[PDB]
Design a protein around this ligand. Structure first.
Ligand code: A1AJ7
Ligand code: A1AJ7
Lengths: 156, 39
């Protein structure tokens, strides 16, 4: 199938028409997405098959065809861009200054941008075009608006 | 059955729309990978 680096929509035909359940990143021959998007299921790319290779429900991440390759990190100071790929809409870069999720195990960058649930897995980029994490696992705050963690894996 | 379709290159866009605030939130992450607000 298609193995070119880039952002991809994750689609399904199980429901009405063709529905976008999420997004992912192809880099170094490995497809990266959020676990809640595929639930660890196999994927199709044209005639080819992508099998899961690594996954973790707690991190909410999964990789296909090989190990997790994304290791860039938010520097804690600079603006970033969400490369949002919404259902039925063109890919679009949105620049923002991340906030912070403070946890008992440390701080994580967070992006306060609201998109349909089928946008989960869209990458967050630094100024060099490197993926520092994926959008789509977060919380709903006081006002009802959404804030996503900048979710990043570990490159072994 | 799930399938993937290319949607673009991964590139920083000069002069992209700038939006969103930067909240500092106390959060917890459970075994199911769900975030919650700590208050
Ligand atoms: C850093 C973050 O936990 C992780 C650790 C490693 C990889 C992903 C995540 C997530 N999500 C935390 N809760 O402090
Ligand atoms: C509140 C939550 O929304 C999202 C989930 C994942 C990714 C983006 C959003 C947004 N916006 C939901 N649908 O329950």
């Amino acid at each position: 199938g298609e193995t070119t680096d880039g952002v991809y929509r994750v689609m399904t035909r199980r429901l009405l028409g063709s529905t976008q359940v999420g997004v992912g990143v192809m880099q170094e021959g490995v497809f990266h997405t959020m676990w809640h998007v595929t639930k660890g299921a196999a994927l199709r790319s044209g005639e080819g098959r992508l099998d899961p290779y690594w996954g973790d429900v707690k991190q909410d991440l999964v990789s296909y065809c090989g190990p997790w390759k994304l290791d860039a990190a938010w520097d804690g100071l600079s603006e970033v861009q969400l490369l949002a790929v919404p259902p039925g809409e063109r890919a679009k870069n949105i620049q923002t200054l991340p906030g912070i999720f403070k946890t008992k195990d440390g701080d994580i960058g967070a992006v306060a941008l609201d998109y349909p649930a089928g946008t989960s897995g869209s990458p967050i980029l630094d100024k060099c075009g490197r993926v520092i994490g994926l959008y789509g696992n977060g919380v709903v705050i006081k006002n009802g608006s959404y804030v996503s963690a900048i979710t990043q894996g570990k490159r072994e | 059955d799930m399938y993937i379709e290319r949607a673009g290159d991964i590139t920083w866009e000069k002069d992209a729309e700038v939006t969103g605030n930067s909240p500092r939130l106390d959060v917890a992450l459970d075994e199911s990978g769900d975030f919650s607000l700590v208050e």
